[PDB]
Design a protein around this ligand. Structure first.
Ligand SMILES: [Zn+2]
Lengths: 368, 1042, 308
């Protein structure tokens, strides 16, 4: 009698994000990836083709009208054009379809990085500072101790220390084999893929049995998180993002009064610009420092998109005010829940000054 | 002795013009490039000013800005060739302050508010640990720059916390300054206390001091002695990054006891050493040391337009210097002239942003002259450099004893701004450092010396003296009468012999503001109702025919001469020409003076700013005599309300809980009727399809609705427009001849009146139209509003009410002479609110009507007798009774009460009631709103909010809780979905109602779908599921977005 | 362990020592060798329609695979060092546009591409310092990046140049005439129509954010759609039309519905009804006229007169 019974929330895998955004065309071409940081054309005021407001990805700007103007009127329902490949349908779909952005390098979801419980840190059993340094390209991590004697698994290496290790490994007399180091969110993804949850659970349970005090409490928290992951059948490396979803364009409207634009457009443009620059740098074999700085920039841009000002500096706008990111929409007294779901402005309502009507009855009111 | 009331706003601009802009130009004058080849000198002492274009009235009527152009002479000097190309460069456009203390920005009157901030200097504080001793810290705060915090630990250690970084022992800072141990040992008075820190932290030398300072300030970099030195020089020693200010230097010298020159405005070694010594002495309780209070008005300052402007000019000048250096070094050839070197865009932008978009420049309050006057005398604790609403707490919003005679303890807002905005007192003034002063008369051997001139004094000065209030009574000549006299000593109230009083306040109203000084019999009112009355006196509306109060207070003629709307003759002669728009007076032996009067203009608050003449043709006129008067003045003095007959008794429920019952005479006698002028605007733009045209060829309209258009598509001056009437006819080229679309401007629902002005502005006429517009039409519509059910009426003593009934004058109670009353007020509201002063004014007003007199009673009038107000009122009423001859006017058994009869039946009420003449005001503000269906929000598809766009009323979560407690499920579900954002259920419900069927079941509101999409966009795989019915089936994910 | 990102990049930069002119010349020779070798490989890619193997590429240079690979490495490292040691120059140039639409870090990363191109096109034989040639490329890359990434509604580079020239002409006229020039004067001086000038002025504007305080701007903007009220004069209308259609003969009404697309939204010709219906073309025209003539009478259709 009711359409849905329960609401379930889980950790999003990249496959799910792609499914949310990837839709196929009759021609066989698949669409749903935002590749250009372009919103609209300045002269025609018409959305670009592979941008944040594309009609081939999100839907036609005008209902039952094609982008190029080949098809118009309702008569053409479900007819994807051929010149531009836009689906002639209702424009309402522009507020339901998402599309996605594929990242040149993986980034870390700031929610699982910078939280009161740091789930990445708890799972990796590492202090939050070390995880942040690895993520933001301030230290290396020993993904594999290999054959070295003074190197331990998951050990932070400074730049000088890594240079010394490089000198050791490139010595003609070195028996050192199989040492691996990593920096960035890719290293975190490798560490998260290394975790075998069943064995970690068994080891933690055995250690908890022979433990007490704060050590027991910390191992209890680790076991709780690990058991949650075991039950949910979700891989922990999904906390490191390879693709990100794009919100439908009607939820970040770019209306004309001048053009008034949502802050999501600017944040998404930063993400796309940095991702494209990173891809170019990886295509021309740029110096390693430049590529690493671009990866750090991409991580920061995605961070500002997910929650502006949680980790680093706050991205201000044209005026010195914080940009409203995705997290700022669903929280606070001005957030979605408290401003639009638990309380709404309603129709069939009026408001006026009240005077005393002494001849009215208790069940009556005087309405102008 | 009242001086110019709006002088805090003039002195700060006269100062800016005289020596505020010069100091900032000269402070940045010598600009040099990096090669040191070219140098720009700004001879800023010779800045000339170009006369304002247009005019004040032209700027107002054109919707422009009243400003001048600034030109400074400059000289570009080539360091080698020596060619100097002297010239005068355009610096910017400076908006000018009018004769009334205001600015005209974009054709609107604006006022720069005064900001109360913390004064620069050094402030000591003692903090107590949960279990530890008292530990003292000192904060050094400049006019502009970085703060220098000192702290004493529990073990006797001295720490410094540059900026908000980690602490560092004071030895590092003192050695980095370039001081040997002997000098810092000698200057300190108790050197062993600092020797403990020296021993515990190790004697740093200068080199390692700078190394550690650099290491702590900027971690991660290799320390460098020069690096540290430069960091310190840029932090506390750079004249262009650290400014103590004149007040900062003055306060530092006064507190620390130094002697440094007033010209040096940066921190020096002496300063820090002294401050440390004072902290040590305060720790050791030396005797001449004391912690500071930050709410004291001696540690707080006032900034006005001059200072705030100076700062904006400084920022603009920094940007300009950056641009100049960039466009100076790049040039490989000395083909540059000073005209081509300076770019006035950053300075113009900074000044424009300050005057148009800052939160310290405010849209003028212009309801009446009192609101205008108190808007220029307002002190704010909020702004760029003050407090924030969430950070201001209980301590900041209270009355500090040091407010006595400088800030009014009554006049404030109510709500979130309570205690954060105040009003300057009557006699208070601000000196050139920024501290509020107040005047006193000197008292020698118990004699008040009014022959000598008032001695002004600041909050810190009048802490060691014993100051008597302004209500103390003196005998012939000046001796103070009595044996005990109230005085204030060290922010405390005591009593002394009148031979040990040092100063006496000038007036009894020296403690309150100007709006609160206009309330007669104020000492018989509660302070909360006094606040209400003072606040509501500034919301009164100028009426069609104003009238002076009969029980005025004496400050009315002075409260109206500062708004600059009353015209007085400066000349002792005769009047030769009187007109509705012009007055001319010929000096007895001299030239003719001519005045033009404003007529039916419009204020920021849509009231009318009329001006009418008082005199007649061929009239003898003396100097200082009123010639014309404003919209809220009668003959010289303020007039915000009217005097009407009032009785205090309950009606048949129409007086219930502050409601007001009035007579119909207030409607047909044009009492409490006012003129309100509104402005409507239409814009002709250029769309991609084409431009927009103003014409009478409007589609889907008949000639019966184009009667009053001026054959150009615009309504005519003098036409009566009702609701929905077209004002300007416009057509847009829509895309789908039969192609034009109608978006002509029409009167909003519920608005009517006459059209009095239709101004047109097009780019051809030489007007500054918006970027994408091609015609701006502005229409002004005026109307006369009468008192009606739902309007707010008020008195000067805080008694507000809403009119609930307007009775025909043969139903209202009447007097023993046949006069029906004008208003009946409930006495139930008087004793619980303690505004007894209203019961005194009425009675005195009654006497004043009967004696054809007007009484000027000053507040706190009981210094002359034991009960002065009551005795004066009783004597006046008895005198009126004897002069008139009617014994029913005044009765000895019930002084203030006389017999009143019932207009409906003719029977007298059981007991006499209190009647009198009361001075009541009609308050501003258009609030009735209703909606069925209208515009919706973009993201949530919920109805918009706002009266001007057919907005809905919000159903908050408290109302949801209320409906949940009732057990209501269907009212709640219909409100939440069908009437707000069920995008498909709204149309179905509306169609069912129109057709008469049943409203169908709702669906999922649009805000929920928006939230699910946003949560998915946060990389959350949240979804909605339908459970499987049978056993061997999986739960199915439901698609809401379909 | 600082949290600032720019300062961390500046430290990472400072760990590299500036090159000397002889070092620049030496690296330039190795860079040229790498470029020529890359060109050759590109030739092999055209010949093979695939990436050549290192052995095939070594064979194309008549070089032992070891020697060739080491030469390749040396060249890679040389170009890497040339870019790496000049990043300080990139930062020095990029700091001069930190308030134009791109953040400082974006200016640095966009100028790095220009430095890379400059290091790819530097000629030691020219006998000039690398800091002179590289500046042009760094400046060009940053300027292009600003032109293509500073605005939400991106404007083409020619539009930026047009706006700059308009500003310069306006300032020149203001200096010459001693007053603010009018629109017509500027349009004549620019030899362009006034409408083009107004179009440029309108397109140069920056988009205002939805959250500008007015309370935010985004809560005062209506939504595009059909008012629930305007949808009810649609259902109502069709019914009225259908009623008057019922009065017409069955064939007649079918003809009308098909000739106006009342069912499919698509107006059909004569010939589609000529084929779909029984009789052919030139018959449906008669039916259409004989139906309209019935409707045109004041009877059976007068409500719709007000809909006009
Ligand atoms: Zn198409």
């Amino acid at each position: 009698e009711q359409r849905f019974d329960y609401v379930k929330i889980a950790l999003a895998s990249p496959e799910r994000i792609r499914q949310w955004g990837e839709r196929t065309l009759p021609n066989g071409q698949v669409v749903g990836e935002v590749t250009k940081p372009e919103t609209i054309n300045y002269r025609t005021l018409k959305p670009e083709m592979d941008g944040l407001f594309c009609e081939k990805i999100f839907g036609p700007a005008k209902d039952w009208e094609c982008h190029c103007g080949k098809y118009k009127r309702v008569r053409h329902r479900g007819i994807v054009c051929e010149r531009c490949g836009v689906e002639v349908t209702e424009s309402r779909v522009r507020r339901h379809r998402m599309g996605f952005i594929k990242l040149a390098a993986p980034v870390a979801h700031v929610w699982y990085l910078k939280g009161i419980p740091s789930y990445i840190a708890i799972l990796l059993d590492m202090p939050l500072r070390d995880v942040e340094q690895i993520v933001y390209f301030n230290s290396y991590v020993v993904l594999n101790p290999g054959n070295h004697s003074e190197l331990q698994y998951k050990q932070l290496l400074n730049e000088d220390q890594w240079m010394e290790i490089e000198d050791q490994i490139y010595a003609e007399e070195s028996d050192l084999e199989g040492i691996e180091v990593g920096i960035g969110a890719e290293a975190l993804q490798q560490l998260l893929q290394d975790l075998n949850l069943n064995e970690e659970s068994e080891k933690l349970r055995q250690e908890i049995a022979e433990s007490k005090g704060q050590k027991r409490a910390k191992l209890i928290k680790r076991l709780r998180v690990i058991d949650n992951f075991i039950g949910t059948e979700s891989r922990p490396e999904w906390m490191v993002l390879n693709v990100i979803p794009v919100i439908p364009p009607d939820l970040r409207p770019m209306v004309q009064l001048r053009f008034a634009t949502s802050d999501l457009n600017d944040l998404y443009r930063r993400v796309i610009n940095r991702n494209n620059r990173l891809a170019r740098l990886q295509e021309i074999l740029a110096p390693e420092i430049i590529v690493r700085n671009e990866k750090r920039m991409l991580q920061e841009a995605v961070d500002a998109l997910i929650d502006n000002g949680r980790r680093g500096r706050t991205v201000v706008g044209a005026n010195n005010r914080p940009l409203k990111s995705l997290s700022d929409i669903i929280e606070g007294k001005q957030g979605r829940f408290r401003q639009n779901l638990l309380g709404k402005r309603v129709d069939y309502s009026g408001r006026s000054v009240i005077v005393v009507g002494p001849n009215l009855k208790i069940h009556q009111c005087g309405l102008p | 002795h009242l001086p110019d009331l709006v002088a805090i706003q003039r002195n700060s601009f006269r100062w800016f013009l005289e020596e505020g802009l010069i100091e900032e130009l000269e402070s940045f004058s010598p600009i040099t490039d990096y090669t040191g080849k070219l140098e720009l000198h700004f001879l800023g002492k010779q800045y000339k000013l170009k006369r304002p274009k247009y005019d004040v009235d032209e700027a107002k009527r054109r919707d422009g800005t009243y400003s001048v152009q600034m030109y400074v002479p400059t000289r570009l000097i080539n360091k080698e060739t020596g060619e100097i190309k002297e010239q005068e460069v355009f610096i910017g456009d400076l908006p000018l302050m009018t004769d009334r203390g205001t600015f005209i920005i974009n054709g609107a009157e604006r006022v720069i508010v005064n900001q109360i901030v913390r004064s620069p200097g050094v402030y000591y504080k003692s903090e107590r640990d949960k279990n530890g001793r008292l530990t003292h810290n000192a904060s050094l705060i400049p006019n502009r720059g970085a703060w220098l915090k000192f702290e004493t630990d529990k073990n006797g250690l001295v720490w410094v916390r540059i900026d908000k970084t980690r602490k560092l022992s004071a030895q590092v800072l003192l050695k980095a300054l370039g001081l040997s141990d002997n000098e810092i040992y000698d200057k300190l008075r108790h050197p062993e206390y600092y020797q403990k820190t020296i021993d515990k932290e190790g004697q740093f030398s200068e080199d390692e001091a700078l190394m550690e300072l650099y290491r702590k300030l900027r971690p991660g970099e290799p320390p460098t002695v020069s690096g540290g030195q430069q960091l310190l020089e840029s932090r506390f020693f750079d004249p262009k990054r650290y400014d103590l200010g004149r007040v900062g230097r003055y306060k530092l010298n006064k507190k620390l006891g130094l002697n440094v020159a007033d010209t040096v405005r940066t921190l020096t070694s002496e300063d820090i050493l002294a401050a440390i010594d004072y902290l040590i002495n305060l720790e050791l309780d030396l005797g001449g040391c004391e912690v500071d209070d930050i709410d004291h008005l001696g540690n707080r300052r006032v900034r006005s337009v001059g200072e705030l402007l100076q700062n904006q000019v400084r920022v603009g000048l920094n940007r300009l210097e950056r641009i100049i250096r960039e466009r100076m070094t790049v040039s490989d050839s000395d083909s540059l002239s000073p005209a081509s070197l300076v770019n006035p865009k950053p300075l113009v932008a900074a000044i424009k942003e300050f005057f148009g978009s800052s939160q310290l420049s405010q849209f003028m309050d212009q309801t009446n002259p009192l609101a205008e006057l108190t808007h220029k005398r307002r002190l704010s604790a909020l702004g760029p450099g003050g407090l924030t609403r969430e950070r201001a707490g209980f301590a900041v919003r209270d009355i500090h004893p040091s407010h006595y005679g400088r800030i009014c303890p009554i006049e404030t807002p109510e709500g979130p701004n309570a205690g954060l905005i105040g009003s300057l007192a009557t006699h208070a003034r601000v000196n050139d450092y920024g501290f509020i002063e107040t005047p006193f008369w000197r008292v020698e051997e118990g004699r008040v010396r009014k022959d000598l001139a008032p001695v002004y004094m600041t909050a810190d000065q009048e802490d060691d003296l014993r100051v008597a209030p302004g209500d103390v009574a003196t005998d012939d000549a000046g001796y103070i009468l009595g044996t005990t006299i109230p005085v204030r000593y060290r922010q405390d109230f005591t009593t002394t012999t009148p031979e040990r009083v040092d100063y006496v306040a000038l007036s009894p109203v020296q403690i309150i503001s100007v709006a609160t000084s206009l309330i007669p019999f104020l000492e018989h009112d509660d302070a909360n109702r006094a606040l209400m009355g003072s606040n509501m006196q500034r919301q009164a509306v100028p009426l069609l025919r104003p009238e002076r109060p009969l029980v005025g207070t004496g400050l009315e003629p002075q409260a109206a001469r500062d708004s600059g709307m009353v015209i007085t003759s400066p000349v002792d002669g005769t009047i030769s020409y009187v007109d509705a728009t012009h007055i001319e007076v010929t000096a007895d032996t001299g030239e003719k003076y001519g005045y033009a009067l404003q007529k039916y203009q419009r204020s920021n608050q849509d009231t009318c700013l009329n001006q009418r003449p008082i005199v007649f043709e061929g009239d003898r006129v003396q100097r200082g005599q009123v010639i014309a008067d404003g919209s809220a003045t009668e003959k010289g003095e303020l007039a915000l309300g009217q005097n009407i007959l009032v009785a205090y008794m309950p009606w048949e429920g129409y007086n219930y809980e502050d409601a007001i019952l009035i007579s119909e005479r207030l409607v047909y006698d044009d009492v409490y009727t006012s003129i309100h002028i509104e402005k409507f605007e239409i814009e002709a733009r250029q769309t991609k399809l084409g431009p927009e045209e103003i014409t009478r060829e409007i589609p889907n309209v008949g000639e019966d609705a184009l009667r009053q258009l001026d054959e150009n598509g615009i309504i005519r001056v003098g036409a009566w427009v009702e609701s929905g009437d077209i004002l300007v006819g416009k057509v847009t080229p829509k895309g789908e001849a039969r192609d034009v679309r109608d978006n002509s401007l029409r009167v909003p629902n519920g608005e009517k009146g006459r059209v009095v002005d239709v101004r047109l502005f097009t780019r051809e006429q030489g007007d500054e139209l918006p970027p994408g517009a091609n015609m701006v039409v502005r229409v002004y519509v005026a109307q006369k509003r009468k008192i009606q059910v739902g309007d707010k009426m008020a008195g000067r003593h805080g008694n507000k009410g809403i009119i609930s009934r307007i009775l025909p004058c043969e139903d209202m109670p009447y007097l023993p002479d046949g006069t029906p009353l004008d208003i009946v007020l409930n006495p139930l509201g008087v004793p619980s609110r303690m505004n007894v002063g209203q019961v005194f004014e009425c009675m005195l007003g009654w006497a004043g009507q009967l004696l054809d007199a007007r009484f000027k009673v000053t507040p706190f009038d009981e210094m002359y007798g034991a009960e002065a107000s009551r005795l004066t009122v009783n004597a006046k009423l008895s005198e009126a009774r004897e002069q008139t001859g009617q014994p029913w006017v005044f009765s000895d058994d019930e002084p203030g009460k006389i017999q009143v009869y019932d207009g409906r039946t003719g029977e007298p009420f059981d007991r006499p009631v209190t009647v009198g003449r009361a001075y009541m005001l009609k308050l501003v503000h258009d609030k009735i709103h209703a909606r069925s269906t209208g515009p919706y929000s973009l993201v949530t598809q919920q109805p918009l909010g706002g009266k001007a766009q057919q907005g809905g009323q919000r159903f908050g979560e408290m109302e949801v809780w209320a409906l949940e407690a009732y057990g209501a499920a269907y009212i709640l579900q219909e409100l939440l979905t069908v009437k707000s954002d069920d995008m498909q259920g709204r149309n179905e419900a509306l169609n069912a109602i129109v057709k008469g069927k049943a409203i169908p079941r709702p669906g999922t509101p649009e805000s929920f779908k928006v939230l699910m999409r946003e949560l998915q966009s946060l990389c959350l795989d949240i979804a909605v599921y339908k459970a499987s019915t049978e056993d061997y089936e999986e739960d199915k994910e439901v698609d809401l977005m379909a | 362990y600082t949290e600032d990102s720019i300062r961390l990049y500046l430290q990472e930069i400072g760990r590299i020592r500036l090159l000397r002119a002889d070092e620049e010349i030496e690296l330039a020779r190795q860079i040229a060798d790498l470029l020529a070798l890359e060109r050759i490989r590109d030739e092999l890619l055209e010949q093979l329609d695939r990436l050549p193997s290192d052995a095939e590429w070594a064979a194309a240079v008549d070089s032992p695979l070891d020697e060739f690979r080491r030469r390749l490495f040396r060249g890679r490292r040389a170009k890497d060092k040339m870019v790496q040691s000049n990043l300080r120059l990139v930062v020095s140039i990029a700091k001069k546009y930190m308030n134009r639409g791109l953040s400082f870090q974006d200016l640095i990363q966009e100028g790095s591409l220009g430095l890379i191109r400059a290091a790819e096109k530097f000629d030691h034989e020219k006998g000039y310092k690398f800091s002179t040639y590289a500046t042009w490329w760094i400046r060009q890359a940053i300027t292009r990046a600003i032109a293509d990434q500073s605005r939400t509604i991106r404007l083409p580079v020619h539009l930026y140049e047009t706006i700059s020239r308009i500003k310069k002409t306006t300032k020149l006229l203001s200096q010459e005439m001693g007053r603010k020039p009018t629109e017509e004067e500027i349009a004549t001086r620019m030899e362009m129509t006034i409408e083009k000038l107004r179009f440029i002025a309108k397109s140069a504007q920056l988009p205002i954010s939805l959250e500008t305080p007015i309370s935010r701007l985004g809560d005062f903007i209506e939504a595009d759609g059909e008012t629930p009220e305007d949808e009810v004069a649609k259902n109502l209308l069709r019914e009225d039309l259908e009623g008057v259609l019922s009065t017409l003969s069955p064939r007649e009404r079918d003809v009308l519905r098909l000739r106006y697309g009342l069912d499919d939204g698509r107006m059909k010709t004569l010939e589609e009804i000529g084929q779909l219906f029984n009789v052919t073309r030139e018959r449906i025209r008669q039916i259409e006229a004989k139906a309209l003539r019935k409707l045109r009478h004041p009877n059976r259709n007068s409500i719709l007169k007000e809909y006009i």
